[PDB]
Motif scaffolding. Structure first.
Motif, PDB file in Angstrom:
ATOM      1  N   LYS A   1       0.843  -1.179   0.000  1.00  0.00           N
ATOM      2  CA  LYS A   1       0.000   0.000   0.000  1.00  0.00           C
ATOM      3  C   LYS A   1       0.881   1.232   0.000  1.00  0.00           C
ATOM      4  O   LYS A   1       1.742   1.389   0.870  1.00  0.00           O
TER       5      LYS A   1
ATOM      6  N   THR B   1      -7.168   4.990  -3.222  1.00  0.00           N
ATOM      7  CA  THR B   1      -6.207   4.079  -2.626  1.00  0.00           C
ATOM      8  C   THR B   1      -5.329   3.478  -3.706  1.00  0.00           C
ATOM      9  O   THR B   1      -5.815   2.841  -4.642  1.00  0.00           O
TER      10      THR B   1
ATOM     11  N   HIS C   1     -11.006  -2.311  -0.609  1.00  0.00           N
ATOM     12  CA  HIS C   1     -10.695  -1.022  -0.025  1.00  0.00           C
ATOM     13  C   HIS C   1     -11.564   0.088  -0.586  1.00  0.00           C
ATOM     14  O   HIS C   1     -12.420   0.614   0.127  1.00  0.00           O
TER      15      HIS C   1
END
Ligand SMILES: Nc1ncnc2c1ncn2[C@@H]1O[C@H](COP(=O)(O)OP(=O)(O)OP(=O)(O)O)[C@@H](O)[C@H]1O
Ligand SMILES: Nc1ncnc2c1ncn2[C@@H]1O[C@H](COP(=O)(O)OP(=O)(O)OP(=O)(O)O)[C@@H](O)[C@H]1O
Ligand SMILES: [Mg+2]
Ligand SMILES: [Mg+2]
Lengths: 394, 49, 384
Positions: free
Chosen positions: C130, C201, C232
């Motif tokens: 991430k 994201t 997400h």
């Protein structure tokens, strides 16, 4: 006019919501529980009633019985094994062998039988949910739609026309062609229309690290498949799960082949699946094993090729029905410009041809906007195009 | 003090644990060497920071 | 908390006044509605009385458990940490909705009954793959391209910022975007300005690190990867250098190419699966576009194909101007002699020459960068 007078009369009641809702009790943001205003069933009674009379009743597994007497043979997770007994609340009928049973921690006696193990990675690939894909949307291959649908649902929706005629309907069918032709998209209309257990399987998910590991997963899949009456099992991209056997020298690709042999055994031989229908789809069928390609497993053999002219025009009328366009365009011109072309390419041309109207400041596409799509998608991407060695399926 | 050792040594052993992290309402998450994780409390003499 | 979602007059109107006045009277009704319950039913405190009644139900040795099945009448089979599983029951303060197979729950010490559930401590890899912050400067850092940047905003950014345009058109955005050209041509560099620009994201993964030593660990890593991407938000999945799965063979892989193949098959599912995909975008980049499987490159899987050419010389001077913007250039130099030194220099080459020349000035403790700095600098950078 009343600028502050709407703002603070707004704000003191937006706060006064919370200022007494804290005095209700929703607060103390937790670590894994429930709302304090809800649980009050187990408040004074089940707190000492679902707890204090209630046991733990640890679950076990039956080995076997013996004659003339219960004298059961139990088995547990790690520990040793006992000769055990029923309770009075159950009959010795459904206390068959190889069964999970709930058992007290002290007398070690049987309380209730349990369902067996399901291996929840198999449970995950039950879809539980249907997509929206209409048979209206796979237009152009309507004979394939018919020839498949007469196999898939017609015994399930009418189990009398085959019976009173006296024929057993087929059970197996593969679907194959070049990519993007509507194989998977076609399967989504089936998963749309259907009602029973639609258990999907992608073969690369069976690629395991241990030995025999996916092979037992096959077995369990057919276990819970045999629990249901009618069930549809989906197979996507089965070239990973097997081409054929070609072994020479050091054993290469050994592990995949044994799982494929289990897939053979679960399909044909010794009081089989019964009412369990299967459906494979590949890209390149030429790699596939002949005993897999034996009928009785893969009876219907549906091809998906490009539409002639009219199916392509129909696909234009499918993807192009819902976009702002010039009224007086014609699609047959565009279908003449797309001889060797899939409906995914047709949709991509629709979506790019909208983007041309999105380029400067137009609301509806024109014919020459479509022409701006054609040379770019067809002829400028013509280096790639992905199709022709899949037309021969190499 | 010395006579007291005959009594206080009758107290049982003390476990040893391992903090993953703490959560709400004065509680922590602690796992043993080869034994599973527990959500337990703190005593008064131990600060959360 | 989500009391009234309506704001639509957006002025000084008696509409927006009467909204609150109504909801004013309702919230006062809730206040004095609950006010009588403790006035005529004190009987408890209800703020901690029933609460510590729950906490007097549940014991302090809270063992941590994991689900494996559900029977609806608040009992199920739950697995122990040792493994010896039980058939305990489930409470009424368990708020029976967050119960999925494999979840962590809270059990009794004594009867091991399902006390509560447990929030899961995220995942080490989610944070690892991430991307946290914007890497660097905007699209103004790049220069020279100016056409495919409109392509990238077209397929990526404009779907995000203006979801009106597709709706007045009767259309959805294009799905897959791919980037290819010579090496060092700013392929990753554009993705940095994308990662600057977006609020979604963002995920980034090299194509090299897909491969494993365990069988199926690659495709499993794919499945959990797309799980992470889907679970997400409007997410941007970037892949760099996806050719490396086909180019290099490593002996850490137990399987040969006939495991690499299966990896590419599972990925190939995750592009064009029958499941409802959601709002995840796919940006790909490599330099060897001719090498991989065209089946992944079909429309339906990738819609937009973006080449990056070598820079022309009038764009080169712009790239020199960018990589010489904030530096104390001594006026000894002429950039145009630096342009035609290599006919086919990359944008990495210019910055390599500039930075290495700054290294040469910092050998001599200087502040400005002279001509011979570039003279021996291109000797260092190019010829070896
Ligand atoms: N007959 C058709 N009508 C409309 N769209 C189609 C048709 N055939 C294919 N498509 C388009 O192709 C895309 C992919 O379809 P599908 O996934 O079924 O391809 P496929 O034939 O299964 O090949 P692959 O297995 O590689 O995906 C879909 O998004 C759909 O829009
Ligand atoms: N047009 C350009 N303008 C400014 N700088 C550039 C340009 N092209 C390349 N560079 C410089 O080259 C470096 C390499 O960029 P990047 O890694 O994106 O190129 P690439 O083609 O992705 O490289 P690779 O092929 O190794 O993946 C960047 O940090 C950038 O500063
Ligand atoms: Mg498909
Ligand atoms: Mg790069």
């Amino acid at each position: 006019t009343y600028s502050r007078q709407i703002k603070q009369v707004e704000d003191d009641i937006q706060q006064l919501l919370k200022k007494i809702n804290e005095l209700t009790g929703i607060k103390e943001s937790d670590t894994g529980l429930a709302p304090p205003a809800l649980w009050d069933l187990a408040a004074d009674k089940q707190t000492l009633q679902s707890e204090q009379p209630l046991q733990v009743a640890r679950c076990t597994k039956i080995i076997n019985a013996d004659s003339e007497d219960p004298k059961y043979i139990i088995n547990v997770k790690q520990f040793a094994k006992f000769v055990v007994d029923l309770s009075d609340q159950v009959a010795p009928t459904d206390i068959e062998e190889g069964m999970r049973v709930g058992v007290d921690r002290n007398k070690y006696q049987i309380h209730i039988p349990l369902p067996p193990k399901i291996d929840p990675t198999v449970t995950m690939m039950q879809v539980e949910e249907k997509p929206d894909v209409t048979y209206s949307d796979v237009g152009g291959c309507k004979e394939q739609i018919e020839k498949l649908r007469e196999v898939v649902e017609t015994p399930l929706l009418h189990p009398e026309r085959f019976v009173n005629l006296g024929i057993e309907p087929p059970k197996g069918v593969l679907l194959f062609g070049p990519p993007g032709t509507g194989k998977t998209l076609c399967a989504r209309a089936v998963a749309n229309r259907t009602d029973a257990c639609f258990i999907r399987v992608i073969g690369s998910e069976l690629v395991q690290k241990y030995v025999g590991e996916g092979a037992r997963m096959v077995r369990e899949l057919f276990e819970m498949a045999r629990t249901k009456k009618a069930c549809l099992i989906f197979f996507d991209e089965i070239d990973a799960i097997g081409g054929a056997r070609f072994d020479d020298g050091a054993g290469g690709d050994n592990e995949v082949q044994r799982t494929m042999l289990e897939l053979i055994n679960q399909l044909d031989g010794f009081d089989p699946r019964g009412n369990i229908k299967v459906l494979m789809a590949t890209n390149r069928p030429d790699t596939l094993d002949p005993a897999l390609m034996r009928p009785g497993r893969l009876d219907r053999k549906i091809e998906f090729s490009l539409p002639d002219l009219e199916g392509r025009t129909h696909i234009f009328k499918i993807h192009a029905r819902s976009m702002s366009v010039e009224r007086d365009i014609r699609f047959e011109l565009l279908a003449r410009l797309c001889p060797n072309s899939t409906g995914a390419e047709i949709r991509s041309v629709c979506t790019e041809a909208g983007m041309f109207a999105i380029r400067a400041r137009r609301k509806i596409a024109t014919e020459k906007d479509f022409l701006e799509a054609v040379n770019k998608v067809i002829k400028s991407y013509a280096k790639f195009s992905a199709t022709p060695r899949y037309m021969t399926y190499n | 003090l010395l006579r007291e050792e005959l009594q206080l040594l009758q107290e049982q052993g003390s476990y040893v644990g391992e903090v993953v992290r703490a959560m709400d309402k004065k509680k922590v998450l602690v796992k043993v060497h080869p034994e599973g994780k527990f959500v337990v409390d703190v005593d008064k003499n131990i600060d959360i920071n | 908390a989500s009391k009234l979602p309506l704001v639509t007059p957006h002025t000084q109107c008696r509409l927006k006044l009467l909204k609150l006045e109504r909801i004013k009277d309702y919230l006062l009704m809730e206040e004095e509605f609950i006010r009588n319950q403790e006035q005529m039913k004190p009987l408890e405190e209800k703020q901690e009385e029933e609460r510590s009644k729950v906490d007097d139900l549940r014991g302090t040795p809270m063992s941590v458990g994991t689900l494996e099945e559900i029977i609806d009448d608040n009992h199920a089979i739950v697995s122990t940490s040792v493994g010896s599983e039980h058939y305990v029951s489930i409470l009424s303060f368990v708020d029976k909705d967050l119960l999925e197979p494999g979840c962590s729950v809270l059990l009794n010490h004594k009867v091991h009954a399902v006390i509560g559930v447990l929030m899961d401590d995220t995942d080490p890899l989610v944070t690892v793959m991430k991307v946290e912050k914007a890497p660097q400067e905007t699209y103004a850092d790049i220069g020279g391209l100016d056409n495919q940047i409109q392509e990238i905003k077209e397929s990526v950014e404009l779907p995000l910022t203006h979801p009106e345009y597709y709706e007045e058109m009767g259309i959805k955005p294009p799905k897959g975007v791919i980037l290819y050209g010579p090496p060092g041509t700013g392929k990753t560099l554009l993705a940095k300005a994308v990662a600057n620009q977006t609020s979604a994201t963002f995920l980034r993964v090299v194509g090299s690190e897909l491969i494993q030593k365990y069988l199926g660990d690659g495709p499993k890593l794919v499945r959990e990867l797309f799980r992470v991407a889907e679970e997400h938000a409007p997410s941007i999945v970037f892949i760099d250098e996806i050719d490396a799965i086909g180019t290099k063979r490593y002996d850490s892989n137990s399987g040969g190419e006939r495991e690499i193949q299966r990896t590419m098959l599972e990925l190939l599912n995750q592009l064009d699966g029958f499941d409802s995909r959601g709002d995840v975008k796919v940006i790909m980049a490599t330099n060897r576009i001719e090498t991989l499987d065209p089946a992944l490159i079909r429309p339906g899987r990738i819609d937009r194909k973006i080449e990056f050419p070598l820079p022309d010389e009038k764009t080169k001077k712009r790239i020199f101007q960018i990589h010489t913007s904030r530096m104390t250039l001594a006026d000894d130099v002429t950039l145009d002699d630096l342009i035609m030194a290599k006919d086919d220099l990359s944008g990495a080459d210019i910055k390599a020459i500039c930075t290495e020349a700054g290294l040469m000035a910092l050998r001599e403790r200087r502040m400005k960068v002279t001509n011979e700095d570039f003279k021996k600098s291109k000797e260092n950078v190019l010829y070896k």
